[PDB]
Amino acid sequence: HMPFEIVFDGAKEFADLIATASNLIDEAAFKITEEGVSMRAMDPSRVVLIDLNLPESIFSKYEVEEPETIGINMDHFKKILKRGKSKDTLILRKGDENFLEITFEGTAKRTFRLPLIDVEELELELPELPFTAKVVLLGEVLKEAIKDASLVSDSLKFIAKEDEFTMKAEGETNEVEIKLTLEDEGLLDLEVEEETRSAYGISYLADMVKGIGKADEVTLRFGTEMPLQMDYFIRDEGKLTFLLAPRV
Amino acid sequence: HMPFEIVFDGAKEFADLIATASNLIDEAAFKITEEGVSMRAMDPSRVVLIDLNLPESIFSKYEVEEPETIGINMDHFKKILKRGKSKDTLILRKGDENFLEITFEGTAKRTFRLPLIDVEELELELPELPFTAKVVLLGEVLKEAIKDASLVSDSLKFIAKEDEFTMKAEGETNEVEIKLTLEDEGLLDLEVEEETRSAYGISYLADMVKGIGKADEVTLRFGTEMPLQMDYFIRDEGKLTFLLAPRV
Amino acid sequence: HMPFEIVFDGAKEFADLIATASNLIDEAAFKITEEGVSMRAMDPSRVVLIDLNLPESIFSKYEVEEPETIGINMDHFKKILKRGKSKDTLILRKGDENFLEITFEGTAKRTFRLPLIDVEELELELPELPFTAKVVLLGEVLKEAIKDASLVSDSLKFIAKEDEFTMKAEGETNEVEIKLTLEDEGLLDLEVEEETRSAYGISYLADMVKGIGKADEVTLRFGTEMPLQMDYFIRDEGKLTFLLAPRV
């Protein structure tokens, strides 16, 4: 197999990015091409599809000789990546053997070897879906709404109308409603082709947003009784996308 | 029953205030009048009386049509109030039904409904007591003294003389003494009509001061073998008062 | 026995210093002389020798009438010292009786009495050893290397060559290497008489460095199959030294 070397400036930020996807994934195939690194995976229950796309432009050095796929234990990977410091440079390097060499370069050079595994490749595509609502909002609104709703229920209803986005949860001894209009600072954009209603499991939503930052911009696309698509951008050009089955 | 709407600027600070009283209380009757909101309660052991007085002037909007009392599960209330952010506006609103509508307004509008309960109203008054010592001190001195004493014993002796306030605890394998004179920055005022000695349970004192801030000014009034009265002010005009039975 | 009074400006910093040695020690004899305070102890397994030297110059007041030794329960001592604040002045005073009086003076005067114990005095000396490598490095490099290695193994190999210092750990499902040259900011000095290799237990190293600060300068001296000597300086003139048996 051909070697590659991939360098990212800011190892803690790369660790944070990986921890977001690792919240639902145990293992993942990473496709390394000359245009960038991509990773598509499902959670063990097949309720959530994760798609992480890291184009070559976000790496300070990108040397990939031929396309290849590597399989990675995500919790081992996250354990090593959690050792990187904010100011560290991260180097991912594969030689001829079956392991990833992970180097942090900062006040010292620290090198880990991570054994590569074989990951069964479900043939996962991200199809195009007839979404009828798009919502852009601040991560902290989304995070707090999912936490608020968890005080009440295990499912969260999303309601998009022309002028307002509403998340609503109700239980026996409680109820909670989170409402956004474009007058609110939490809602950066709202495009609604028609009145759209759908519900989603809170345990999955919490794991999806746990690593998202309070100032991150998150785009939601959904439809009536359709999956929820949730993405946010990494370093302007990278992108993390979740696709979440509806609660029906 | 008549509706009311009550608005407080700074929801996290209102949550903090409620958590202080919630440390000893499971449930409480809130008397809502046109002059403000008051709450008088005892802990389950009847050792501590709590009196919280929130005058209308600390609320940015105060619309109370007729006096009424509502009963509240304090741990449910604290759970909801803990979701408010520092910059949020808090709205407490009762309509015609038997629930409190709690709204946080900030980057988004989040609304919870809290079921109102029935709280047995012990006829609690805050009588006037012939205290012989008054002490004003910084919260952190009081907090650290109670923590220091807990390393040693389960009761804390308060000793007020004309020129010094002393808190003293002794156990078998330890002893601790905390001494204040007006020369010390921790003691803002000391008025002692006669030499005064009394002891109090540390487990109650710790729960009383847990939510008090390090820079808060706390007034203590006590007498020989008498209850301890402890109060501090909320937004200059609100007031939280504890009355604690002596250890005899 | 003769009284003494010893005053240290900055009680939290004295607590931190004591907690470093307390990580491996349960009890210790403190020799109080006119030149300063010293403490030599071994961990319960006799794998680590600890030597703490606090010269009279680091104390704002130092009144010792005649040399004497006192025995101290280190976990009781640390428990009391943890109550001191950053701005507090710490006073250690022995009168005629068999207890240490520990006073924190700040916003208030708080006084604890700590019973003195009898500590069996192993006749411990810090002999001179034919070390062949000396390494000065930033504490955070050392701390992170020991943490990195603990992901992999229970022993850490130290390798000193003329131009590089290497710490290396290997396990079955992992390996880690930390490399320093004088080009690196983590390595402040490297003196190597000959190529030196030795290994040490990670559980002991972690307890040795747990209290060391990220910006502290740490000196390591070791030899092939010899003990590791690790010291850093307290207030320029105090010194904490560990001597750690090799893993053979």
Taking the C-alpha atoms of residue B122 and residue B29, their distance in angstroms, rounded to an integer, is 10
Taking the C-alpha atoms of residue A126 and residue C58, their distance in angstroms, rounded to an integer, is 67
C-beta atoms of A108 and C151 within 8 A: no
Range of the domain at A220: 1-248
Report the sign of the C-alpha dihedral through residues B71, B73, B74, B79, in that order: negative
Q: Copy the structure tokens of residue B133.
A: 């010592």
Partners of C88 on chain B (C-beta within 8 Å) are: none
Q: Copy the structure tokens of residue A87.
A: 């100011």
Residue the block writes with tokens 């008051």 = B38
Nearest to C111 among B176, B180, B185 (CB): B176
Strands (DSSP E) found in chain A: 4-9, 27-33, 36-42, 48-55, 61-64, 68-73, 89-94, 99-105, 109-115, 133-138, 155-160, 164-170, 175-181, 187-192, 196-201, 217-222, 228-234, 238-244
- Are the beta carbons of B185 and B138 closer than 8 angstroms? yes
A241: closest CA of chain B, how far (Å): 24
- C-alpha separations of B218 from B22, B107, B167, B221, C176 in Å: 18, 35, 15, 10, 55
Report the sign of the C-alpha dihedral through residues A24, A27, A28, A30, in that order: positive
> For testing the chain C interface, which of A88, A101, A109 should be mutated: the one with the most C CBs within 10 Å?
A109
Q: What is the dihedral of CA C236, C241, C247, C248, to 10 degrees?
A: 120
Burial class (CB in 10 A: 0-12, 13-18, 19+), B100: buried
Taking the C-alpha atoms of residue B190 and residue C125, their distance in angstroms, rounded to an integer, is 55
Q: Copy the structure tokens of residue B246.
A: 């002596």
* Experimental method of this PDB entry: X-ray
C25: CB partners within 8 A, 6+ apart: C41, C42, C43, C50, C74
Q: Copy the structure tokens of residue A77.
A: 């990977």
Q: Is A164 on the interface with B (CB under 8 A)?
A: no
Residue the block writes with tokens 């040397």 = A63
Taking the C-alpha atoms of residue A5 and residue B67, their distance in angstroms, rounded to an integer, is 73
Q: Helical H runs in chain C?
A: 11-22, 74-81, 139-150, 202-209
Q: Is B93 on the interface with A (CB under 8 A)?
A: no
Cβ atoms < 10 Å from Cβ of A39: 22
Partners of C113 on chain B (C-beta within 8 Å) are: 174-176
Using the 8-state DSSP alphabet, how is residue B128 labeled?
-
Which 3 state secondary structure label does DSSP give B12? helix
A49: CB partners within 8 A, 6+ apart: A40, A41, A42, A124, A126, A242, A243
Strands (DSSP E) found in chain C: 4-9, 27-33, 36-42, 48-55, 61-64, 68-73, 89-94, 99-105, 109-115, 133-138, 155-160, 164-170, 175-181, 187-192, 196-201, 217-222, 228-234, 238-244
C-beta atoms of C174 and A110 within 8 A: no
A228 beta partners: A244
Partners of B141 on chain C (C-beta within 8 Å) are: 107-108
Using the 8-state DSSP alphabet, how is residue A98 labeled?
S
- Are the beta carbons of C205 and C213 closer than 8 angstroms? no
A90 beta partners: A8, A104
Residue the block writes with tokens 């060499």 = A101
Total number of domains constituting chain C: 1
Taking the C-alpha atoms of residue C228 and residue C45, their distance in angstroms, rounded to an integer, is 16
C41 beta partners: C50
C127: CB partners within 8 A, 6+ apart: none
Which 3 state secondary structure label does DSSP give B74? helix
Beta-sheet strand order (sheet of C155-160): A61-64, A4-9, A89-94, A99-105, A109-115, C175-181, C164-170, C155-160, C196-201
Partners of B115 on chain A (C-beta within 8 Å) are: 173-174
Taking the C-alpha atoms of residue C237 and residue C218, their distance in angstroms, rounded to an integer, is 14
